[PDB]
């Protein structure tokens, strides 16, 4: 009995979307001038780690950065002079995530053990020491992002997310509804909304104060690994394991474009945007990175080679530098100017 | 040069910091790691506790033989699926697998799991060591009646006599010699798909036995030796 009503409601929802397809965005941009070829060069290299590397992050001042390894160590570097500032040991070896605070006073990390911990740096005595630990989860973590000083968000392998308060160290809200493992999440310019995706090949939207979902998408047919936002805040893109990338909108609520080539068989790992939103970058398993045109959907360059798998990417705030990492325990920086 | 007085202090600080990493690496390169797996029916916990002499998610144990340090790990609370987090163990030494030979009705799942683990894309260059357990119940049930294997696994009736190379380490009736049949059903699968990049080692075990630690050492030494020959290019 209830199945028929559900089918009726699904069909009613499907009916509306047909009319909104007023035009195809391919036709309205065929007259735009192309962009052209691009070349870049390497500037600096950083050695030091004894094993493979997983994650990295940038700072607000655009001068400092932090990196992690599965050998149980964290290092902070000075980009201009290539000098090491601090090194901190760990009690656990299996780590996956790290983050940086906006004011530069606090840092957090996590791993297989269901704890995203925090550390302090500024004290009268010279030494780095731990402050607090948060527990309560039943699955391995994926990411824990800062937001403000006294707030933090986290996701876990189990299909639930929660919010925390450092002062009392207890949760305040929980979100549920998924049926598969959750992998990634991203915040918005104005901190009121955020998105996340899971292995169910679907995405959702959430409200922070209220705590209820609003919208969903189902495009892909395979696992989803990466997601990122647009500077305006009304669009986002996703990557999948089936060697495809797609775009979405919030007010129209339908897909726009797809990028693919017949020569590629491997998957994707990371994705990031530029300042003006004209350029898009992504990495692959085959030791190569590619660049794409956001408006014309054509490839325009390559970023040389590496000796092993590539993991992470990042762009600075001022948009003058970009770094890359891989499993070969080495890091590189590119400027690409003439 | 153009450097100021203050920068040289930072240079010296970095130079001093750089040293400890070499000693750390030297200490690091002198340890081995192992991974353990099994099912509820197996006596994994009993073996661990005997060898020793809330939501943690991981457990650790240590032991020393001949002034050599070994590390072992186990997993705790996790969901059923194993697809995603398996990738992290690409560079471990060896794996151990435990099985209950007494029960007959639940034998096919073990074979299915073995076939599943054997051919994964991320483990082409890792070997496996296999243990069998609980022989006393097998012997006691074989001596008595009211049970048979022909009901479950046909083709045992046409099976030959024990192979010519089968030894006789104990004085027992010929009926007790049914372990070789099971040993050949697992080795049959392991036989194929091999091109000299990984190997398998079977063994027998008893209830609450001892001298288990000595066994792993020889295989570990042999496996370590085999790699260097390929490394140089002489093999």
């Amino acid at each position, epitope marked *: 009995q209830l199945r028929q009503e559900a089918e009726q409601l699904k069909n009613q929802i499907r009916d509306a979307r047909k009319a909104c397809a007023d035009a195809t965005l391919s036709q309205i941009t065929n007259n735009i001038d192309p962009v052209g070829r691009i070349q870049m060069r390497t500037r600096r290299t950083l050695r030091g780690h004894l094993a493979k590397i997983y994650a990295m992050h940038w700072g607000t001042d655009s001068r400092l950065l932090v990196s992690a390894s599965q050998d149980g160590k964290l290092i902070i570097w*000075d980009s201009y002079t290539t000098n090491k*500032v601090h090194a901190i040991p760990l009690r656990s070896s299996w780590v996956m995530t790290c983050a940086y605070a906006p004011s530069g006073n606090y840092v957090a990390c996590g791993g297989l053990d269901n704890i995203c911990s925090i550390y302090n740096l500024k004290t*009268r*005595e*010279g*030494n780095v020491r731990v402050s607090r630990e948060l527990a309560g989860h039943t699955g391995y973590l994926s990411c824990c992002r800062f937001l403000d000083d006294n707030q933090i968000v986290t996701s876990s392998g189990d299909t639930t997310c929660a919010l925390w308060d450092i002062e009392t160290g207890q949760q305040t809200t929980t979100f549920t509804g998924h049926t598969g493992d959750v992998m990634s999440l991203s915040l918005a310019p104005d901190t009121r909304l955020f998105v996340s995706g899971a292995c169910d090949a679907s995405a959702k939207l959430w409200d922070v104060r209220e705590g209820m979902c609003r919208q969903t998408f189902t495009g892909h047919e395979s696992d989803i690994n990466a997601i990122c936002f647009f500077p305006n805040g009304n669009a986002f893109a996703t990557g999948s394991d089936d060697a495809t990338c797609r775009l979405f909108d919030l007010r129209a609520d339908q897909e726009l474009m797809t990028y693919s080539h017949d020569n590629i068989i491997c998957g994707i790992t990371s994705v990031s945007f530029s300042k003006s939103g004209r350029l898009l970058l992504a990495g692959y398993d085959d030791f190569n990175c590619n660049v794409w045109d956001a408006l014309k959907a054509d490839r325009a360059g390559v970023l040389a080679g590496h000796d092993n798998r590539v993991s992470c990417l990042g762009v600075t705030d001022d948009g003058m530098a970009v770094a890359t990492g891989s499993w070969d325990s080495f890091l590189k920086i590119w400027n690409g100017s003439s | 040069c*153009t450097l*100021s*007085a*203050e920068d040289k*202090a*930072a240079v*010296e*600080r970095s130079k*001093m910091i750089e040293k400890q990493l070499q000693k750390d690496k030297q200490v690091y390169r002198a340890t081995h790691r192992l991974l353990l797996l099994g099912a509820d029916n197996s006596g994994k916990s009993t073996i661990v506790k005997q060898m020793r002499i809330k939501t943690s998610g991981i457990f650790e144990t240590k032991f020393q033989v001949d002034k050599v340090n070994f590390h072992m790990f186990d997993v705790g609370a996790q969901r059923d699926e194993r697809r995603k987090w398996i990738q992290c163990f690409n560079d471990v030494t060896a794996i151990i697998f435990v099985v209950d030979s007494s029960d007959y009705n639940r034998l096919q799942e073990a074979l299915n799991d073995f076939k599943s683990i054997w051919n994964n894309r991320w483990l082409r260059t890792i070997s496996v060591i296999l243990f069998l357990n609980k022989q006393d119940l097998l012997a006691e049930k074989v001596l008595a009646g009211k049970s048979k294997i022909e009901d479950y696994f046909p083709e045992f009736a046409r099976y030959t006599t024990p192979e010519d190379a089968t030894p006789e380490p104990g004085e027992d009736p010929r009926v007790t010699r049914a372990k070789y049949f099971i040993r050949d059903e697992f080795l049959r699968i392991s036989t194929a798909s091999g091109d000299g990049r990984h190997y398998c080692y079977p063994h027998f075990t008893c209830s609450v036995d001892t001298e288990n630690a000595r066994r792993i050492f020889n295989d570990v030494t042999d496996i370590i030796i085999k790699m260097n020959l390929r490394d140089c290019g002489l093999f």
Partner: single-chain antibody
Amino acid sequence: VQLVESGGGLVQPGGSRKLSCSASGFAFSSFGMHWVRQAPEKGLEWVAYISSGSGTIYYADTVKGRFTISRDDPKNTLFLQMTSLRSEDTAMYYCVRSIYYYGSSPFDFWGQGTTLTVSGSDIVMTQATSSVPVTPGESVSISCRSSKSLLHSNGNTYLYWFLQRPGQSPQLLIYRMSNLASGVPDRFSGSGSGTAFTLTISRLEAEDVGVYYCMQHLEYPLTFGAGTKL
């Protein structure tokens, strides 16, 4: 964080003496040390330095050949040796600490001293004394001059200030000409130019009375000015 020293006494010409210091309450291995002395009715003077790794040592011209310094890490103690004393060595001594890295504050702490009895660039400031009412609206300013350009190609300028009160050790207020210390009130302000610098104070209160000083840190030979009353 406390520091204490011992020594001193009475000697005749052609003698020798030794001094020692003790520390507690912080990681000792990460900091360098310095020495300073003062005259009964004169200014300050710099003596020596030692690095964290015991890799560099430096001395002044006047005491280059006679004085020696040593460090002991396990015992957390410092030593100093003297010989061939003269009649012009009556002074009181002090100790300081320092540390360096991107964004660090070198000088933060000072200690007491012990008494003893025996029987390049120029920096300039004047206006020895001035009158000050106690009304809150009152404001004062001070100036100083140098004989060489302190600006470097990097873009940083090195200048420091200090204040002393009756029967108490000096204190630090501002570093690098534009930065305030952690605990100092926000009333104080400072600015300067290539070869001219100034200080400003507003909303005076009774506790402010004291004497002030300045220092330069470009070339290793360090020189000090003479302070001004208020």
